[PDB]
């Protein structure tokens, strides 16, 4: 045809295999989408005469190299460097303590450092070879344009809750940032871990331990399968006995195997390139009146706002407070950001129960969903909390449902609205251990003897009334907090939204705009593997 | 086609891969943009007959070389040489102590010298090969022309605050200087660090320590993987035991590996060239009536002024005073420029609180934003500071917001204006330790017990009222200073804008024209990594 | 095309890569511009038949060579030889003690000789191969012609201060001299430094120390990487222990590495040539009535005068008097020319202050700039110097500013003029140490306690009133001198323009025609790196 293939039949050259203009998810370092365009218009080459480039980029060669002889120690896993995306993870002073905390590389480092009390160590060979950018005169792609008018067309007829669902679908396909800088090259990076007690017993030889690791790295590369290397004489015997694991990885060129020299690895560095860092801008910056020609003036300033709150919602859902200091008790694993809420003693409390009733405000006739909302108290029954309830609001939203009506041969569809709220009970002033509720396997069910019952259409947290077997798996309760109201149990919403000292928060049942939570000291809820990131959508689409 | 490709099909020669005319960011040594043009008009070569050049440059060959046998010691990290941009970082006697203080190379040298009390050492091989320039008869590019009329078209209709936003967008894409000189070549530079106590114990052998380092550098290059080199006999045993780390880097030719001779490295020096220094002029010099033909006379002299204040604003935001001497107490890390404000004892003070109220000057009806501005005192409440307030001004600006009105089928858009100011409270004359405020993890929240509340729509600095747990994380307060007014607490705005001896300034919440600050002696706010540079824009765009 | 490329397709020969006719900056040995022309008119070759030359030059071959066996000692860094530009740096008996004092080569020699009490030593191999010149029948270039009529067109309508700005723009782009002689060739030059005490202890063996250095230079070239060379037997052991550093550089041919014989270096000397000396004439000599045809008679004699004063102004700005003898106290580093003002004892003085007022001579109405000029005394206030003022003039010039007036739909632009002068105070006859002013980090601010305030719109030199902390960083004041008036404090403008014995001058705030100065004995202002040359422009352009 005519296009990309026309240039390769006239010059006999490869194409550069790394371009900017794509999207970039920021909290998971992975690429998707093409938010810009590139058209192989006429013909172009790099000035060295080795590649074929698109029409609007420009390259400036650097041809650098690096080789270090001493490894370095980066501690304190709450702040780290990713060695493949470093210029893009620190910019703009945004909510950046959560940034980069869900990569494939980060979750393997945190799992290693907490099991055997470890600190890490790395040594690399860089070999930078290029740097490309983009000129500021640019257009959007054909794909990104067709789905950008759609969020404007559903917004010009005044439909809130119908554009925010289309907005959160845009972050899933095109990421949060737009990378406009890259640089090709290779690397050869050899990570290592060491025990914590080894680093402290000989502090004066801190320049002598890392000097051995840089010498041992060149013996793994430059020698063959056997062991004729000279590090096994004096000091590497107290080494090689406190390291837990190590791995050598390479992100460029021919695949690495122990036995090639350093000469032969850098010889075949051409035609195998990848980005080793990048930098860009947020997504709410490329929605400009200069960028979109035909859309009107004061309408594109609202599109740039409604896509900003979606990517701000994506940052505030999957974030977790809690303690992070390793030597203290109640060390809350599965917690990325620090809170400083450690060193707090605990005091027990008491809980009453929960019973739900339906309201049915705007449903006059032909509405049958009120008895689905029903849930009674397992201790008393009807509208009589034992002694402890005092009114909070905690929730207000609408649950809709639609039905097909037969009006006759021809059918018109209509829906009905409602309103719902639940209740809760707690200890009143001072009631002794008698008439106390015991609160609750990797199952859908509670342990034996306990009985669960529904709360909010998908979750189950159990209530039980026994005093011989119920203390086998009982956990003390801390208190709910929510989107607007705060926890009244703290400070013995005028207060803040957290949990008192000695407990740990947990997420539960996000529902249409913001989520609710609870906290409970268990010691067993914290264990397990690390959770993946919670991806959008969040709000279910209204059905017109 | 016809153009660049027409010349290469008739001569069979490469193209020179380094040209002037691009932009150059000055405080981060990196390149972007093409503020000049080059058109491959007819045909040209260099007079040696090895490259193809643009139509308006001229090259003068030099063919130099260098090789030194003794390394040198550059101390005092506040002033340094970058070895890749030296002729451009010292010119014009501008605000140049901040110049070059945010490169990739500089931030790695400062981190090494402060951890282990180090001084550096380098030895290089230069091999200069060319020097190109530009003739003074020149035009602007097509891209730079189209975005230069736009800052004139929005200025001819008298819109201040709408051109300064377009001005600060120009510094982001095209840098602060314009490089018109380069010189191709290579290098081979081997940095090294040494302890501070080693250099002082034998001062008479200062010509003998550096003579060994120059001999050891040629053994790493010219010999193979093993160790048959003759430096391990007499004096290198007291060496190789105080060095912390070292790295060999090369910025030209084939990639470096230990084992090539010095002969084979300089043989393949052709077709791999890069700039190793450069020099240029500021950006407010290439806006001239001779440069732009069609724009009128006394209008281009205003464009050259409004782009000068933007690049002067970019230099004065990211700069930090504070102490820099390493041996003294309160050593303020993360501080580039010196102040001389060390050796000052400290005295505690007391702070009262902060409460905010809205004004609503020009909003008669249909304006609902006044209660968003509300913030009350956590100690007293209404308009009654305890004993200490005395009026300062500290701020005056406008907060705008717009709303879509329905005038009917057809919609016209209009906005509303306002004015705001906050308040503050401090100790009056002499009040004892009773009724004193305790002032405040890498989180959005304060530590436990403390409560934060909003100040200026994005920041939070906490107030707390307790006297048992509040002293766990209390910090003494120093005083605010701002854009126009000064700190009255100094000299125990007629005074200057700084903080008394023993504290350290910090930036906070830049808002529309200049920023405010505070200072607090912590000992823990200074630690951490180095911050990246704060890039423009600064002023949010008005919405017409 | 037809031109340069037509000759190379018929003869298959290279082009000579070094031509005269360009410009030449004299105090910085670097090249720019093409003030003459060369047109490859018909065809030509050198008579040997190896190169292609322009139409109006002529070459006379010499084919010389040199090789010396004994190095030589050049002392006294105030006068030196540059070894690449020697015939052009000594001519015409002009202001030549400042000539060549700002090269890249000179600033590295002065830094080495002052740190370790050193004297230099060199030995070279010359190999001259050609010499070209230009016939006196010649034309100007197309580029230099178009910018030469412009300085005449703005001069024929009687605009002083509008042509001198265009004159100083010509020296920036085309240098001060015009080189019309060169000679191609190579070199191989090996510099060296030695201690000062080694040369004096054995004066009788002065022919024996330099005889060893010439023998050791041929062993570095002609032998391989190892050490099988025979200089390590008798006398080189008391050598190689007082040298500080050495470097081998080469400015022609293939790049140098230790290991090629002297045979192989001179074999590939073809097609790699550069100038190793040159000589020319000043720039005010090529503006002649025979040179420019169309311009009238008595008008070109004024153009030759107004460009002579600009290049004389460029020589007198960046020049510094002061002491230069190394063994004496108050050794003023950063001083190129000698003054002989050493060996002078010192006596303290006292200073009063400075207060400024505006005049507003020719501004009747709509002029608002007078209160910007205001600056009051920090000690007394209004028009009352304490006891010491006596009138001098010291300054007279005009500060202009323009404003856009709305006369209506149509706008005409007009400016307003003024006049300004500052004041100063000093000790009267004999006042004791009471009521004395203490006069003042690499910052914009003074040290702590001190307060700065504005003097002349860009500079700040501080005044302070304290007697406990102010003596921490106090410096004694010497006295101002200026363009026309002299210092009255000397000879205890009828006197000269200098500073009494024991102090050191410094430049400050050049403003529109000539600069002012001051002097202060510090001991700390002299330290630091060497400053670069101050480039033109100097006078800001009037705005018509
Ligand atoms: C445009 O959208 C707004 C909501 O953003 C609608 O305003 C609501 O109007 C109803 C009655 O018409 C009120 O009961 C609601 O309280 C309003 N919402 C709010 C948040 O106050 C408005 O009706 C819509 N207009 C059209 C033509 O659809
Ligand atoms: C972990 O490293 C420590 C060093 O910090 C090792 O402890 C030393 O081992 C040597 C080897 O024989 C002994 O001579 C020392 O007496 C040990 N103690 C100290 C305080 O130096 C330790 O052996 C390593 N761990 C394991 C499992 O080998
Ligand atoms: C041109 O811009 C100036 C501001 O630079 C405008 O001057 C303001 O005019 C209003 C009333 O018209 C005054 O209340 C303001 O105080 C003025 N500004 C200042 C800084 O004094 C001027 O109105 C503009 N003219 C046009 C036609 O838009
Ligand atoms: C750092 O260097 C110093 C030299 O300045 C070393 O100190 C000397 O080391 C030699 C080696 O055996 C001893 O003979 C000397 O007695 C030491 N002291 C002095 C004052 O010369 C020091 O050992 C080095 N640091 C380390 C950790 O080895
Ligand atoms: C030509 O330039 C001269 C200055 O070189 C002008 O002379 C000035 O004339 C004004 C009044 O016309 C006097 O007040 C000044 O004192 C004169 N200058 C000097 C230095 O004495 C002259 O006016 C100019 N002529 C024209 C036609 O522009
Ligand atoms: C600098 O050179 C001087 C010679 O001028 C050296 O001094 C002599 O060194 C020899 C070598 O053993 C001794 O035998 C002599 O006694 C020394 N003195 C004299 C007066 O000749 C000196 O050693 C050199 N500097 C250094 C640091 O070695």
From Swiss-Prot, chains A, B, C:
Keywords noted in UniProt: Adaptive immunity, Cytoplasmic vesicle, Disease variant, Disulfide bond, Glycoprotein, Immunity, Innate immunity, Membrane, Secreted, Signal, Transmembrane, Transmembrane beta strand, Transmembrane helix, Ubl conjugation
Post-translational modification: Proteolytically processed in two steps to generate the Macrophage-expressed gene 1 protein, processed form: cleaved by trypsin in proximity of the helical transmembrane domain releases the ectodomain into the lysosomal lumen to orient the pore-forming domain toward the endogenous membranes, and processed by the asparagine endopeptidase (LGMN).
Region (P2): 386-544
Activity modulation comment: Forms arc- and ring-shaped pre-pores on top of the membrane at neutral to slightly acidic pH conditions and converts to pores upon acidification. Undergoes transition from the pre-pore to the pore in a processive clockwise hand-over-hand process. In the pore state, 2 alpha-helical regions refold into transmembrane hairpins (TMH1 and TMH2) in each protomer that form in the ensemble complex giant beta-barrel transmembrane pores.
Transmembrane segments: 86-93, 100-105, 208-217, 221-229
Positions annotated with a glycan in the UniProt record: 158, 242, 348
Site (Cleavage): residue numbering on this chain: 325-326, 330-333
One record GO biological process: defense response to bacterium
Disulfide-bond pairs as recorded: 7-43, 323-342, 358-370, 408-409, 483-514, 499-519
Tissue: Expressed constitutively in a variety of cell types including macrophages, natural killer cells, neutrophils, keratinocytes and monocytes. In skin, expressed in both hematopoietic and non-hematopoietic cells with expression detected in a variety of cell types including keratinocytes, fibroblasts and endothelial cells.
Domain MACPF: 3-318
Any GO molecular function: wide pore channel activity
CC terms in the record's Gene Ontology section: cytoplasmic vesicle; extracellular region; phagocytic vesicle; phagocytic vesicle membrane; phagolysosome membrane
Up-regulation conditions: By wounding; increased levels are observed in hematopoietic cells 48 hours after wounding. Following wounding, repressed by infection with S.aureus. Isoform 1: By lipopolysaccharide and TNF. Isoform 2: By lipopolysaccharide and TNF.
Function description: Pore-forming protein involved in both innate and adaptive immunity. Plays a central role in antigen cross-presentation in dendritic cells by forming a pore in antigen-containing compartments, thereby promoting delivery of antigens for cross-presentation. Also involved in innate immune response following bacterial infection; shows antibacterial activity against a wide spectrum of Gram-positive, Gram-negative and acid-fast bacteria.
Record note on domains: The MACPF domain includes the central machinery of pore formation: acidification causes a significant structural rearrangement, leading to oligomerization and deployment of the transmembrane beta-strands (named TMH1 and TMH2) that enter the membrane as amphipathic beta-hairpins. The P2 region contains beta-hairpins to interact with target membranes.
Entry's disease: Immunodeficiency 77: An autosomal dominant disorder characterized by recurrent, persistent bacterial and fungal infections with multiple unusual organisms. Skin and pulmonary infections are the most common. Patient macrophages show impaired killing of intracellular bacteria and organisms, including non-tubercular mycobacteria, Pseudomonas, Candida, and Aspergillus.
Quaternary structure (record): Homooligomer. Predominantly forms a homooligomeric arc-shaped pore complex instead of complete rings of 16 subunits.
Record family assignment: Belongs to the MPEG1 family.
Descriptive protein name: Macrophage-expressed gene 1 protein
Protein's organism: Homo sapiens
Gene encoding the protein: MPEG1
Shown segment, full-protein numbering: 28 to 602 of 716
């Amino acid at each position: 045809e005519v296009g990309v293939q026309k240039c390769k039949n006239a010059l006999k050259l490869p194409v550069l295999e790394v371009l900017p203009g794509g999207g970039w998810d920021n909290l998971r370092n992975v690429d998707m989408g093409r938010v810009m365009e590139l058209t192989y218009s006429n013909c172009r080459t790099t000035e060295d005469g080795q590649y074929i480039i698109p029409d609007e980029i420009f390259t400036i060669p650097q041809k650098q190299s690096n080789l270090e002889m001493n490894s370095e120690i980066l501690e304190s896993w709450a702040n780290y460097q990713s060695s493949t995306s470093y210029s893009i993870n620190t910019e703009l002073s945004l909510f950046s303590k959560v940034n980069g905390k869900f990569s494939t590389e980060f979750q393997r480092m945190k799992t290693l450092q907490v099991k055997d009390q470890a600190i890490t160590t790395r040594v690399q060979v860089r070999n930078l070879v290029y740097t490309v950018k983009i000129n500021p005169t640019l257009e959007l792609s054909s794909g990104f344009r067709k789905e950008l008018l759609d969020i404007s067309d559903r917004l010009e007829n005044n439909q809130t809750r119908m554009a925010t669902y289309l907005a959160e679908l845009l972050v899933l396909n095109y990421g949060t940032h737009v990378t406009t800088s890259v640089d090709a090259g290779a690397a050869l990076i050899q990570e290592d871990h060491l025990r914590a007690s080894f680093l402290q017993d000989s502090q004066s030889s801190r320049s002598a331990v890392t000097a051995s690791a840089g010498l041992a790295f060149q013996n793994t590369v430059n020698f063959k399968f056997e062991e004729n290397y000279t590090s096994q004489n004096v000091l590497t015997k107290s080494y090689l006995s406190n390291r837990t694991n190590s791995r050598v990885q390479s992100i460029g060129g021919v695949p690495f195997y122990p036995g090639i020299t350093l000469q032969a690895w850098q010889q075949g560095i051409t035609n195998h390139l990848v980005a080793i860092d990048r930098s860009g801008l947020p997504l709410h910056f490329f929605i400009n009146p200069n960028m979109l020609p035909d859309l009107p003036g004061p309408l594109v300033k609202k599109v740039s706002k409604t896509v900003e709150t979606a990517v701000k919602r994506y940052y505030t859902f999957n974030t977790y407070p809690g303690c992070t200091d390793l030597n203290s008790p109640n060390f809350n694993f599965q917690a990325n950001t620090d809170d400083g809420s450690c060193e707090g003693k605990m005091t027990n409390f008491s809980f009453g129960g929960v019973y739900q009733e339906c309201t049915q405000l705007s449903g006059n006739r032909d509405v049958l969903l009120c008895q689905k909302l029903e849930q009674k108290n397992p201790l008393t029954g009807d509208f009589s909390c034992p002694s402890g309830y005092s009114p909070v609001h905690l929730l207000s939203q609408i649950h809709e449902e639609g039905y097909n009506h037969l009006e006759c041969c021809e059918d018109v569809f209509q829906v009905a609205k409602a309103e719902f709220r639940a209740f809760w009970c707690v200890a009143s002033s001072q009631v002794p251990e008698n008439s106390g509720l015991l609160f609750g396997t990797n199952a859908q069910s509670c342990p034996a003897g306990y009985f669960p019952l529904r709360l909010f259409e998908n979750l189950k947290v159990c209530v039980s009334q026994d005093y011989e077997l119920g203390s086998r798996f009982a956990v003390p309760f801390g208190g709910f907090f929510s989107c607007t109201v705060g926890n009244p149990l703290v400070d013995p919403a005028p207060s803040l939204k957290k949990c008192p000292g000695g407990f740990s928060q947990h997420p539960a049942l996000i529902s249409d705009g913001c989520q609710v939570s609870y906290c409970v000291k268990s010691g067993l809820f914290t264990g397990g593997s690390l959770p993946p990131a919670r991806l959008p959508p969040f709000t279910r689409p209204p059905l017109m």
